[PDB]
Amino acid sequence: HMQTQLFIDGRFVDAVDRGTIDVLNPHDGSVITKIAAATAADVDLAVDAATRAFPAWSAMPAAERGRLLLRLADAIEANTEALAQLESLDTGHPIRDSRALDVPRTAACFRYFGGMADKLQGSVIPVDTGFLNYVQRAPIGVVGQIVPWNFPLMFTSWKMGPALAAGNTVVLKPSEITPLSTLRIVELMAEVGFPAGVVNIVPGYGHTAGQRLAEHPGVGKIAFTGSTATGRRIVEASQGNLKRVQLELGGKGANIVFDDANLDAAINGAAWAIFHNQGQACIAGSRLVLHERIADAFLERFVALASSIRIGNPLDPNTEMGPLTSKQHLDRVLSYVDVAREQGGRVLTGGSAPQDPALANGYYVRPTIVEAKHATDRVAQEEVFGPFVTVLRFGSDDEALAIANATEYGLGSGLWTNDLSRAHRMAARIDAGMCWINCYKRVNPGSPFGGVGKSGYGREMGFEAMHDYTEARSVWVNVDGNVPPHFKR
Amino acid sequence: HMQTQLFIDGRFVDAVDRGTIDVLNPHDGSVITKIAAATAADVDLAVDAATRAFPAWSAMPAAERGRLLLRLADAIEANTEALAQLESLDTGHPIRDSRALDVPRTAACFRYFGGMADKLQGSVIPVDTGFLNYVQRAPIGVVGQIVPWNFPLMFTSWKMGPALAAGNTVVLKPSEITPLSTLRIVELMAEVGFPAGVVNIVPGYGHTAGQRLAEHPGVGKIAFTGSTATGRRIVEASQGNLKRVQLELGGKGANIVFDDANLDAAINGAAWAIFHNQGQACIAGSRLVLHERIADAFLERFVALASSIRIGNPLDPNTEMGPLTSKQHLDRVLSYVDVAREQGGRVLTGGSAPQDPALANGYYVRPTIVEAKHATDRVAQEEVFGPFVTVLRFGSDDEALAIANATEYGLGSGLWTNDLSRAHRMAARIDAGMCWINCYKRVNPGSPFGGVGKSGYGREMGFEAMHDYTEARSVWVNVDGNVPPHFKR
Amino acid sequence: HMQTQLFIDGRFVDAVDRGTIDVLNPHDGSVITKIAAATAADVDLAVDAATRAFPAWSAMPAAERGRLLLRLADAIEANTEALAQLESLDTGHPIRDSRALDVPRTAACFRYFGGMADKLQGSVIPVDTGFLNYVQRAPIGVVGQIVPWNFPLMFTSWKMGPALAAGNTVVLKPSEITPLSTLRIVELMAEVGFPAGVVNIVPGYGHTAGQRLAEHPGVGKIAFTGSTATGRRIVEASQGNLKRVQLELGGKGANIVFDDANLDAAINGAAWAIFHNQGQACIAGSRLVLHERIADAFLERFVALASSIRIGNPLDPNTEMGPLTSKQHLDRVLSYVDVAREQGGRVLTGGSAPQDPALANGYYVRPTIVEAKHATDRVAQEEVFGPFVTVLRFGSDDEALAIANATEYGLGSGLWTNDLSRAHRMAARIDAGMCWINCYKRVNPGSPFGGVGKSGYGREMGFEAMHDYTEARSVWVNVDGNVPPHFKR
Amino acid sequence: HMQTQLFIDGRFVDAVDRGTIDVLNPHDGSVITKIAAATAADVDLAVDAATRAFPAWSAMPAAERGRLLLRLADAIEANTEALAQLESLDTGHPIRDSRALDVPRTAACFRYFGGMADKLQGSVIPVDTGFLNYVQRAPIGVVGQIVPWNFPLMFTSWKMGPALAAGNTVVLKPSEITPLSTLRIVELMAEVGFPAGVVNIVPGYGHTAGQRLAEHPGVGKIAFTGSTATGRRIVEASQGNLKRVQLELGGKGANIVFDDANLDAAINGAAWAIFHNQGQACIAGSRLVLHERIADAFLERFVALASSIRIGNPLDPNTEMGPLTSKQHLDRVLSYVDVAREQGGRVLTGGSAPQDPALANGYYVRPTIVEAKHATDRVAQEEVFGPFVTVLRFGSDDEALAIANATEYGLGSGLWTNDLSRAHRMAARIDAGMCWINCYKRVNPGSPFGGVGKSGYGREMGFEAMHDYTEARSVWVNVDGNVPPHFKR
């Protein structure tokens, strides 16, 4: 049985208003299933359940919370193929990706945080004589999490792993475009023994369920991943009760290839950086910044590789690139081909739907490479979020850095060089939360992930995530302080 | 010579529009001086100066940022008397307090952060074989800081200590009601060698300079201490560029006295907690929560102490309590006495201006103790922010806890008992960022200070403040990762 | 099949000289089995195997080392009954203790360190401009571990958990008196996938296998638990190659009962503190230090409880206390009854073997309580290591502290009081690595465990253990330091 | 007035036996002065004083201990020229080096630790429900420190900075060869307000004062820097009371130059690495390991630079290299020149005293460069500790690594290359506590410094030094643990 209902207080249930949403398969636009569609009243029920569960969940020994997460990681791995199939069906990710990347990264992140739960420690502060001052890292309470459609399975672990490990209870609103793997995950949570109310899943529209969750007076923190524009609306919503906010927003990642780069490695790395996940990744290498000396040779080979990518049915293990996750998103991406040409950009390959008649009803676009004239051009500035890379050239390291920092974003970045000093100097100077040298999109559940500036704030992963999901509770005991009276009598 | 101008890019300067504000002495309403009144255009010049200075300030070794803060601490101590006099003149703080508390706490916090600058360390993450992942704690950039009028001198250290130590440049908007000590502090900063543009001071109205600072696109973080309402406006303003936000908003601190307390210590503690600084402290012990068996005995002594407090001219060394800082605030506090009586509270002492004719022109109110009918009464819920304490009684530990947590605030808290288990159990369960046991208002520059819920987020002091004034910069080096091509050919 | 051979390089093997050691059941003195008896040559083979395995084990991603430990914890839990039966057979621990304490503590500690493996992080140091300095916590290499007979199963986890998680390989010499559970643990390690050579177990005499392991030039650290006198010999042995040393040595724990203690709780706590594990615990509460006001009432009840303890066959689930682990150890304990009487001590209960004829061939002694006249008496100074507690009385808190600190040991300690100040003050002033308030012998795999002074140095458990099983590796990159020549030309 | 007596309990005093030692000027063999010669009885007096002082020193707020170290740093800087002159007179270091390096590094280290004192924090461990477990980092007590003659002034700070910051009291035995600057340091300590007994200085012979200090039952830790043989003797002495031990025991540092190195930087780096301080540095780059393709080129320039180094009177600011510190050490270095030639090494420059007759009575030797026939030759294996470098060549990275790791030492190391992967890969694989890339001998008071294997254990500098100068004190409070009785009745 594929689960399709909301999950509130340990049960699968219909939405209060009995609404549904059609969930589509991006390979052919067919209806996979209808899901229950959470609205404000459902979010209220979910927050109520999380509130009731919080005292017992936070009071549970940290090792006990940890153990549940470990059991969940094992269960995810035991269900790898079914979860991969479901994620591919819903998202359009090639089955080879959901098998090799989506499922294992999800399990690995839950396993990490299972081991992390009882490794977060408080502190003892050296203060005045006769005083003891201990500081706990206490959970916040009920945390609300809003997740987009590009890595829905993976994001269950990135969001919930630290939140739960830290002793918070959760209301998570996954994308209504791709909600199916998230409902399976919570089903597994119940199976391994998560208590009722600790995790509540409320798929529904952003403007119904998402808005209520961000505004809710009983929620202590809202975590959001998506567009910079929607990020602003999350911040606006947080004013009501001054809930804490975490934001992972746009990127327009530079992928810089210097003239001493290993071209083999860099060409493959560039293709990985932008075409993996159909470019639907906030850290995609969407700006390919090529040293003038190697640019022609790089592009000859990179264009040939891109043109060869096998586009097709996500469920075929031979498929290398799937469709985009929605029709609207496909049109968004194609529209940027027109934008690019109007500003004198050259389309080196792709920029249209594939020919194959078997793909005619899916949201497919060919890998697209455009060379732009200036780093200020629209396609060099605006997030396309598809398999679409904009090429720029440079001479000096200073030029490469200026290009890298030329946008409104600062999420990921990376560069290919074999010069020791350059690697570290560039990495320090690029405006980004993450910089990959001679690799790209390396993620690890202990390695802090997030942005600077308009790319948001807060970090997923590691001790950083645990810090962001707890609050300092400072306690002072006056043992022998011998404090003189302030008003002497 | 008393400085009265804006401090921008290393120089004292008039405001662009040449506006001024009158700074009053609360002892008598006299105009001490005009100051230059910063508006948006001055904030822009200040942010520009800070932006220009940031690269060289951030590139300075941490130890040498630290040395400057160390030298500043020494310079403050060397100027103790003159600084104390100026603070007392502006704020109404008794000279005995500005000498013993305001100046020393300010010096201690700068000294702490001077030693802290090169103690903040990054991390190295264990990741896949053949990869090196190091994480720096980099400064944010230009940080904006808005501070109120109750501890202006001390706030310079609480705000600027961590921000500067961490490598940020600063634009600070002190209260236009009490700006004078902050201008002397930045003059000392220049004297000890702070580079031009690293610290910029722009006193002006909230709605001119403050609003622009919070909205400014060149500012990476805004820190605000003051009212909940205004805190919401700071949040709203942050949307433009998604700058990070730190908020310290109201408190309504419970001060709980159990029947096994050392009453001598607790009585003195209670008087310190609410009457020090004329009650103008976010962490004031404004709700005195007394066990029924000892409430009458406690009050008889506490009321006698309170009625004896010597109210008078701040510059008199015998003065124990000064005036409130502004006419507006005094009227507010007197309004709450009326409210208290209106809702059936019993004013046990105080509630009106002192009799002494010499004090007729100043913003004086006597220490005020009111016993409230209910924990839901206005004076038991709303921040009065004056030398005004509301008394409530309880029997059981559970009722003490319920009272303690019955407000919209969660900043500080404390309790007096000699029972081991009760002390730790109550401390864990009270909604507050700080809990003092057998003491109150203990502050130390290493001990994290801030609130939960609508009292805000972020922490002053310690490693916590350094974390909130830096960002994670994760760098990955592929040394020997041997990453297979994603598109195999 | 019960394993009895050495475990070297992934296989169970006989000893080079083909020697054996008889393993006795302390309930009746019968030979359970013969084990292979390691000598110096076998230690050499084990070190060689650990040396060969070290590069691949340390190069393994920390998460993959951690996963092995997690799997081992699960395997131990799945085999709780058989492991408990085996430990009880060999050690004399009541089966109810091996089921409820020995097995679960072993699993919990291995699980903790499995989670810990990829949570240990390096650091990045703020240094001169243009330099990058990162510091790794690298494993030491091959570590030797020598473990006594009182908690042999539990000690496998306490020693091997941090060592392995940190990326060291291990040669462990368990006690030849109680080696059987350790050989089962290593077999489980092989089953869950630990590589050959990573863990090597060499049961044999201290003076053959132990001495060679301590002296071995290829071993980078030796960890020892046991007597202070043998610890000296470990230190001596370490001179050869200046290997690192960790020591947990004698204890003579004070268990202090103030006149405001919960007597119910403290009487039960005292019995647990000394009679659990037949008092064969370094942290046993072997000095019961009683406030004069409560001493008579406490003793009447404590003596009644002690004399009611059900002594019997360890394999009966009704048994509350088993025999001591060896004949020679029984005689040590009994000899101290004579010592106690000669210095005018009074035996309140026990001090002889039980009467039950079924127990005649086992190493059984009744729970023994002696009241000594002075804290300087032999039975108040010398470690007895059996179910033998020495009572002293006191008046003031200062005398209780003086008594507590009157021995040559400093391992564990504890006290029973309800006074908040006293509890923290005493805990700070007592010479010990651990102090339990209103409890005793609380152990947790994150909570550092070890002594001060002659009780040794280093810590089991937590991040402290990880620090002690790694070494700092500092790497400096001069990116842009621009260092002027020292000899200017 | 040059102080020459022992410093014990706040006072300069003669030795109990009234013995003295002659302190020589290495420029001319002349007697600077006689110093008091501590023997065992004086060590006893010093440890007694430190024991008496410990309770009040450890009880002082951390910030107050910190403030004293901060003041000391300033006083050192205020006395730069006189300290530099005294250090140069006693040690032979060129005045330019004592001014630019010895004094500033000493001040910087005390300043770092003065700021560190109140930054070391304890922990709160997540444990069973209803228990609070906090862990303090408490000082050890009285610590003994034994220091050689090569950087005597700097060693005062490296040793005493962390020990004092952490709350220990100190008995320091400086080298009797170069005791004078240490006696001035402790005089400054008294001047800035260090309490009597907190720091005690006992210059005397190793076999009288040093041996007693290492054996003393009142000393909780001994820290020793010097020869391997003497380190073994320290270890042996530690057995008495099982005091903690720290050892820094020499080096035979590889300085590897790859064929892609910046030769200008590397030639200057090599000269600094071995000729600074006359090669009397345990981290000296004493093995120059050169890639075959650049070896001849490098050596032609390096030999020319070395031959040009200006040898002469330490008091002349034009002097670049002074004499060795003692006649005995000079004879040892001259003997190693003979050894080098005996084994077929090629002396490329130096190897004997300079001919200038004004230097005839001093312990002078010219910068000496020997190309060795094999990496196993004596001068390629044994510490010469003079301005003496042994050259070896290689052809693959693996050969360079094999050479690097071919000695019995593992203290410092470094390499010069511009290949990114090689830099980090080689740094990870070299057996050493420290690895410098494109630089050498970079030391910072936050960057841990120490060896592996026979080079010792423990670390100077940073949080690492603070850890090694404290002990974990774990306190458990049973608040609401609800522990069932073990013996159910």
Ligand SMILES: Nc1ncnc2c1ncn2[C@@H]1O[C@H](COP(=O)(O)O)[C@@H](O)[C@H]1O
């Ligand atoms: N106004 C909104 N409030 C809350 N959530 C939203 C809003 N708009 C979209 N979302 C959700 O946020 C995720 C991504 O939105 P976007 O930032 O527009 O990429 C999806 O899961 C949406 O359901």
Ligand SMILES: Nc1ncnc2c1ncn2[C@@H]1O[C@H](COP(=O)(O)O)[C@@H](O)[C@H]1O
């Ligand atoms: N709209 C505003 N935006 C920014 N700052 C303000 C605003 N209104 C007042 N402030 C400043 O915030 C501090 C405390 O404000 P409040 O909490 O409104 O009393 C003072 O320095 C005020 O000048």
Ligand SMILES: Nc1ncnc2c1ncn2[C@@H]1O[C@H](COP(=O)(O)O)[C@@H](O)[C@H]1O
């Ligand atoms: N001289 C020794 N050297 C090394 N290990 C020993 C020595 N004597 C005993 N052991 C082992 O260390 C543990 C406890 O020894 P002890 O503390 O002397 O009773 C047991 O496992 C012994 O086999």
Ligand SMILES: Nc1ncnc2c1ncn2[C@@H]1O[C@H](COP(=O)(O)O)[C@@H](O)[C@H]1O
């Ligand atoms: N047996 C010893 N015990 C303790 N310290 C010594 C001993 N012999 C020499 N020292 C001291 O250790 C430092 C370095 O000595 P060494 O390594 O023997 O050259 C000097 O301050 C010596 O005086």
